[PDB]
């Protein structure tokens, strides 16, 4: 370990990729960029497995080096580009648009989108600091740096982005009556309404959230990602609509 690691063994790959343990000895290490190593899905994984457009890494290169895949509004030619959250994924040759969303099974699922709703994106602010020259800027969960923002854009809120222009369209305050989709631990993919926000002076903020079906659970403030205001979502949720069937129903529905 004299320097950065470039390989990634298959067994050490993040679990929610579901790489077969006998397929090979290696896993595609996602190149650095917007999203972390374990909060992202490499572009090769999306095409080969989730969509079956390519059957091996050889054929993923031919698709991507043909300049045929658009991440956000830009077009990426990196086979291991890290695609994480609701960052849109557009394939104009097949005339289809997907959004990389979570689901209740702690997995990345591609939500189909229309062309008019694939032109926008929701970003979660991470910090707001004063730059040099008293120029404020915000850093989003995507990793974008945005110049002079609205003064009400605080640390933990959510904003709507216009992909073609990069402007800010709509912002949602992080309050105690707004929808949120969890992105962290056991709540991964769950959608509910914030009902309580308790703070500990030293370590963490723990948020109590009530599910649409009346279920209640808790998570750390890090995993909260506000989707909309007043139980109304700005994005189309996956098929389960952020509702976790408590075990028995999932087992019974798989039998049927």
């Amino acid at each position: 370990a004299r320097g950065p690691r470039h390989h990634l063994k298959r067994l050490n790959a993040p679990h929610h990729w579901m790489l077969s343990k006998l397929g090979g000895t290696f896993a595609p290490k996602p190149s650095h960029g917007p999203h972390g190593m374990k909060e992202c899905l490499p572009l090769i994984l999306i095409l080969r497995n989730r969509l079956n457009y390519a059957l091996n890494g050889r054929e993923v290169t031919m698709i991507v080096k043909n300049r045929t895949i658009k991440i956000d509004g830009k077009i990426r030619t990196d086979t291991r580009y890290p695609v994480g959250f609701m960052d849109v994924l557009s394939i104009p040759r097949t005339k289809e648009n997907f959004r990389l969303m979570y689901n209740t099974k702690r997995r990345f699922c591609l939500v189909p989108l229309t062309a008019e709703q694939a032109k926008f994106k929701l970003c979660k602010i991470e910090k707001r600091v004063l730059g040099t020259g008293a120029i404020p800027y915000i850093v989003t969960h995507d990793g974008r740096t945005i110049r002079y923002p609205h003064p009400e854009l605080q640390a933990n809120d959510t904003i709507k982005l216009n992909l073609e222009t990069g402007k800010i369209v709509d912002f949602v305050k992080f309050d105690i009556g707004n929808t949120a989709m969890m992105i962290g631990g056991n709540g991964m993919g769950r959608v509910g309404v914030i009902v309580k926000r308790e703070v500990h002076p030293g370590s963490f903020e723990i948020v109590h959230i009530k599910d649409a079906k009346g279920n209640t659970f808790t998570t750390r403030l890090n995993n909260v990602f506000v989707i909309g205001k007043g139980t109304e979502t700005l994005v189309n949720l996956p098929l389960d609509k952020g509702i976790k069937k408590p075990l028995l129903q999932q087992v019974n529905e798989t039998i049927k």
Binding site: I135, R147, Y148, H150, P151
Partner: peptide, 26 residues
Amino acid sequence: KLHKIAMLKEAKRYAAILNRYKVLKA
């Protein structure tokens, strides 16, 4: 060009309208 105010005036477009909603502050 790009550099020449095609970008740079933005940096005075951007700047200026910022000091507007920083001055409402009410």
